[PDB]
Amino acid sequence: KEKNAAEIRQQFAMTAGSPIIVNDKLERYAEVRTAFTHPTSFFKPNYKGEVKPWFLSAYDEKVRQIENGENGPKMKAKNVGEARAGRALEAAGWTLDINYGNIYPNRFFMLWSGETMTNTQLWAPVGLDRRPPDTTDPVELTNYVKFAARMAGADLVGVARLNRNWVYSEAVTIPADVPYEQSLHKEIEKPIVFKDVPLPIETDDELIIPNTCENVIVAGIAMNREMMQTAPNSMACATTAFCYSRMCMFDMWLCQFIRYMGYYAIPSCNGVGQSVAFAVEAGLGQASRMGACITPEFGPNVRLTKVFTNMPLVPDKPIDFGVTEFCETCKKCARECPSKAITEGPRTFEGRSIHNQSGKLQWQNDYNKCLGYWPESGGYCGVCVAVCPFTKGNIWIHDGVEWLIDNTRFLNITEVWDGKINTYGLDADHFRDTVSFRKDRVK
Amino acid sequence: AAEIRQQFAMTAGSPIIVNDKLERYAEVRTAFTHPTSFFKPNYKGEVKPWFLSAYDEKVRQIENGENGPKMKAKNVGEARAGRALEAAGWTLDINYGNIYPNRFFMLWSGETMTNTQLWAPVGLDRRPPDTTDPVELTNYVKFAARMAGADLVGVARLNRNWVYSEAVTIPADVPYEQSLHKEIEKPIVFKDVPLPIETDDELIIPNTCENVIVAGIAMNREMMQTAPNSMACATTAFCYSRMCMFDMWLCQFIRYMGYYAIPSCNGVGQSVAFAVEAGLGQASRMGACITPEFGPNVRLTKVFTNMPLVPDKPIDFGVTEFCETCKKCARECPSKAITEGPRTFEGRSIHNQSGKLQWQNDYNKCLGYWPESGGYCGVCVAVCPFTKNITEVWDGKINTYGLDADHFRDTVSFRKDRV
Numbered sequence: 111k112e113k114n115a116a117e118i119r120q121q122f123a124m125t126a127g128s129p130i131i132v133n134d135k136l137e138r139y140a141e142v143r144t145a146f147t148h149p150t151s152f153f154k155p156n157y158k159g160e161v162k163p164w165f166l167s168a169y170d171e172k173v174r175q176i177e178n179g180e181n182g183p184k185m186k187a188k189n190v191g192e193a194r195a196g197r198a199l200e201a202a203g204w205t206l207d208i209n210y211g212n213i214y215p216n217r218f219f220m221l222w223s224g225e226t227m228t229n230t231q232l233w234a235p236v237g238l239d240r241r242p243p244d245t246t247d248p249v250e251l252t253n254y255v256k257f258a259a260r261m262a263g264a265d266l267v268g269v270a271r272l273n274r275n276w277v278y279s280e281a282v283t284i285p286a287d288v289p290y291e292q293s294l295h296k297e298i299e300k301p302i303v304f305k306d307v308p309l310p311i312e313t314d315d316e317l318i319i320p321n322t323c324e325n326v327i328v329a330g331i332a333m334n335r336e337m338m339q340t341a342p343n344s345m346a347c348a349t350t351a352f353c354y355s356r357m358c359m360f361d362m363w364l365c366q367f368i369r370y371m372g373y374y375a376i377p378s379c380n381g382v383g384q385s386v387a388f389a390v391e392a393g394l395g396q397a398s399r400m401g402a403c404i405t406p407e408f409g410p411n412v413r414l415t416k417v418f419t420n421m422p423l424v425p426d427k428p429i430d431f432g433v434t435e436f437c438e439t440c441k442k443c444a445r446e447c448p449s450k451a452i453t454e455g456p457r458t459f460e461g462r463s464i465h466n467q468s469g470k471l472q473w474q475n476d477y478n479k480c481l482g483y484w485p486e487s488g489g490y491c492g493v494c495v496a497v498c499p500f501t502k503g504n505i506w507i508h509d510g511v512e513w514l515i516d517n518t519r520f521l522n523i524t525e526v527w528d529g530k531i532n533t534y535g536l537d538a539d540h541f542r543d544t545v546s547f548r549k550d551r552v553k
Numbered sequence: 554a555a556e557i558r559q560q561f562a563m564t565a566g567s568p569i570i571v572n573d574k575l576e577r578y579a580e581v582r583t584a585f586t587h588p589t590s591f592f593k594p595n596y597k598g599e600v601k602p603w604f605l606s607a608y609d610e611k612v613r614q615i616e617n618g619e620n621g622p623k624m625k626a627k628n629v630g631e632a633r634a635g636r637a638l639e640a641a642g643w644t645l646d647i648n649y650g651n652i653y654p655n656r657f658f659m660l661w662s663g664e665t666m667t668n669t670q671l672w673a674p675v676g677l678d679r680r681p682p683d684t685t686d687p688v689e690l691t692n693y694v695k696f697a698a699r700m701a702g703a704d705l706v707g708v709a710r711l712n713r714n715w716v717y718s719e720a721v722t723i724p725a726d727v728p729y730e731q732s733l734h735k736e737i738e739k740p741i742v743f744k745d746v747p748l749p750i751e752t753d754d755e756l757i758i759p760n761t762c763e764n765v766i767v768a769g770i771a772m773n774r775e776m777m778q779t780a781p782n783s784m785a786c787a788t789t790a791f792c793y794s795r796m797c798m799f800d801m802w803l804c805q806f807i808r809y810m811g812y813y814a815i816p817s818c819n820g821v822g823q824s825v826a827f828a829v830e831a832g833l834g835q836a837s838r839m840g841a842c843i844t845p846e847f848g849p850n851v852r853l854t855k856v857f858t859n860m861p862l863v864p865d866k867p868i869d870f871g872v873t874e875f876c877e878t879c880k881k882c883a884r885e886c887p888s889k890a891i892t893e894g895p896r897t898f899e900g901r902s903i904h905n906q907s908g909k910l911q912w913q914n915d916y917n918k919c920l921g922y923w924p925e926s927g928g929y930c931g932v933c934v935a936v937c938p939f940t941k942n943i944t945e946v947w948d949g950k951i952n953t954y955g956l957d958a959d960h961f962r963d964t965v966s967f968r969k970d971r972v
């Protein structure tokens with residue numbers, strides 16, 4: 111029986127309700143607490159023992175590997191030119207991303223209003239962003255916005271009501287008068303608040319999201335399997351990087367579509383809130399031991415971005431295809447993790463360190479240990495994603511009655527450069543899995 | 554598809570036939586820019602820049618619940634959604650085509666880009682190349698081109714006949730808000746200099762700029778078949794933003810490999826000629842490059858570089874002989890812009906470059922239909938055999954970037970077909 115991704119999603123659909131289990135110690139999480147930004151984790155030694163911002167120490171390791179003809183830690187390249195080429199591809203992939211994630215809200219690409227954008231100015235005579243909505247029916251709007259999402263580069267798209275528990279209490283950002291070249295030295299915190307205002311607006315003191323901001327649209331941006339399977343080496347860094355620029359394009363495209371439909375839209379990429387939780391509530395997939403959203407189509411080998419809006423929409427149903435029970439017995443990511451960051455224990459409500467948000471039931475991982483491996487390896491690792499059985503393209507089988515996971519699944523870089531590739535790194539052997547008709551956009 | 558393209562490869566040599574009269578063509582002569590064609594009436598009889606008159610028709614259509622000229626939408630909501638999708642598609646494109654060289658997204662150096670600055674401590678853009686072998690470089694850069702969103706990619710030596718003699722641009726310190734009102738003409742010249750450079754007087758391409766890399770960016774078939782209505786405008790628009798990201802991504806890769814790279818999108822030179830010389834397809838009666846995978850339903854962009862590369866062979870799969878007897882685009886064109894006659898070396902008007910054997914079309918007649926219809930037409934692309942209602946499009950099949958899984962296998966690539 112030929113694989114039917116739509117059938118699979120329908121088979122495992124849940125009844126409505128946020129799947130994330132929480133208790134009374136839950137409070138919104140200040141973004142500065144992530145390992146990338148917090149002072150306790152931001153600094154890492156380089157290979158000479160010099161203590162630096164982690165990404166500068168990682169740069170030192172990239173340079174060292176190129177000079178030594180390596181594609182990764184102790185991984186010899188074919189020659190220096192191949193080592194150089196992998197890092198050139200990685201660096202280029204980030205072209206449309208600011209400071210590794212686009213996290214500053216309402217700066218650079220992540221503007222909360224389209225008014226100053228060159229595209230908005232060019233189109234101003236038509237008045238699409240000033241004319242009241244011609245469609246308020248959530249059913250039709252869901253079909254329109256999901257169609258637009260696929261045009262804008264999403265491989266998966268889902269809708270959820272906005273759960274404010276996953277919106278950061280304070281964002282990391284920069285003052286509005288700070289030019290890019292000083293941005294990394296002038297980062298500040300700024301509260302994200304919800305108020306009775308008509309439009310998203312930023313004051314000197316606050317980023318203000320309107321109380322009318324009902325919905326979040328979550329996109330999955332598929333990474334390339336062959337390149338991620340080289341983790342922790344450079345080609346895994348390149349598929350990561352290119353997908354961050356795809357995320358940025360998605361956010362801007364979709365926000366402009368929503369604005370030109372007469373609503374407002376807030377982009378975010380890696381900023382504003384916790385993408386994994388939104389993705390789980392929007393039904394893209396389930397949380398996992400490693401901490402990523404695992405999808406039926408791509409496993410965890412998929413990036414996430416999201417857009418917040420007042421556009422009326424129909425929320426999607428969460429999905430339960432057994433990930434929690436497989437993660438309970440699998441632990442491959444924990445065993446293979448080069449830094450032992452991933453727990454082999456049970457889920458708890460108690461954060462392992464400052465980097466975890468306490469009060470939600472999850473596997474609690476040590477993300478300072480994870481980040482510490484990045485300067486050592488000169489990359490963004492990804493070994494957990496690479497070894498997860500759900501990342502394999504071969505997991506789904508049909509037994510004549512229904513779909514199921516094949517339990518047998520759970521028991522070099524020159525060839526990548528010389529091997530299979532297609533547009534955006536997508537794989538035509540599986541691309542049919544993300545075909546979409548109206549019936550699977552809105553019910 | 555790899556079998557087909559090898560089967561139809563020609564021996565080396567530009568297939569475009571030229572004569573002694575050929576001269577490089579000033580970009581201002583295109584119908585989009587030239588003063589004789591730029592102003593068009595709207596439906597009220599008011600003469601405006603053609604795209605503003607076209608805007609007025611889009612507004613009139615939304616108000617009247619239409620997706621195109623005399624084409625009722627399901628309701629006003631559907632009409633609005635089609636124009637919202639079209640407008641959004643252009644997000645990463647400046648003034649319909651990114652033609653101003655070394656402005657906005659089309660910078661000729663990576664030095665000021667936020668990504669280059671972030672990566673500066675690694676020194677990839679200042680380190681000499683570690684690879685000079687054109688075979689390996691061709692494989693690397695084509696792999697990168699596919700990562701960067703090209704559905705097709707080819708390489709040719711740069712033929713300066715197709716580089717505009719003078720570009721349309723704006724002064725470097727003019728802000729976006731005044732760009733449309735302060736467009737100027739600036740020569741593109743070739744000189745013995747190390748790097749692409751712009752002076753007050755000239756855009757200077759180095760004599761070492763040996764090669765052009767041409768990308769095909771596939772449009773969506775269902776949407777283009779709604780031409781001249783709004784969903785054909787939307788697939789057009791989204792692919793212009795795909796073009797811009799391709800140029801920037803690939804230029805950065807080439808720079809981080811130790812070479813220089815000039816992006817262009819619709820600027821700098823004539824994409825159809827470059828695409829034919831790079832083997833993506835053949836010229837056609839309508840004037841487009843027709844590819845085996847997509848026919849003419851594919852957009853083009855290109856990047857110029859001194860990176861050593863292996864030129865691809867031109868391809869001949871019989872387009873010329875088919876266009877000789879077909880004439881379907883010419884009979885369906887709503888403005889009679891496309892000739893039914895034979896190819897000549899003599900342009901029909903200022904908008905054509907004389908001195909090259911081609912079907913000569915009247916591109917002022919084409920542009921005149923755009924304000925009338927409120928869109929970018931595309932009927933010629935839609936009806937062409939090589940290419941093979943709006944509610945059904947919105948309710949129907951779609952996939953990532955509008956690509957089609959029924960055909961996506963045709964653009965799979967291994968090293969054997971890259972070099």
Ligand SMILES: Oc1cccc(Cl)c1
Pocket residue numbers: 165210211350380490
């Ligand atoms: O969020 C990410 C992911 C990978 C690399 C970096 Cl630097 C940031």
Ligand SMILES: Oc1cccc(Cl)c1
Pocket residue numbers: 604649650789819929
């Ligand atoms: O080059 C193009 C193509 C379509 C529309 C416009 Cl305005 C320009």
Ligand code: SF4
Pocket residue numbers: 398399400401436437438440441442443444494497498499500
């Ligand atoms: S490797 Fe195993 S335990 Fe880890 S996330 Fe994947 S399925 Fe779960």
Ligand code: SF4
Pocket residue numbers: 446447448449450451452479480481483490491492493494495
């Ligand atoms: S990215 Fe690497 S170091 Fe981090 S959790 Fe995954 S396997 Fe461990």
Ligand code: SF4
Pocket residue numbers: 885886887888889890891918919920922929930931932933934
């Ligand atoms: S775009 Fe339309 S008007 Fe222009 S040549 Fe093609 S069919 Fe004719």
Ligand code: SF4
Pocket residue numbers: 837838839840875876877879880881882883933936937938939
């Ligand atoms: S419609 Fe016919 S004559 Fe026109 S470009 Fe296509 S094949 Fe050629």
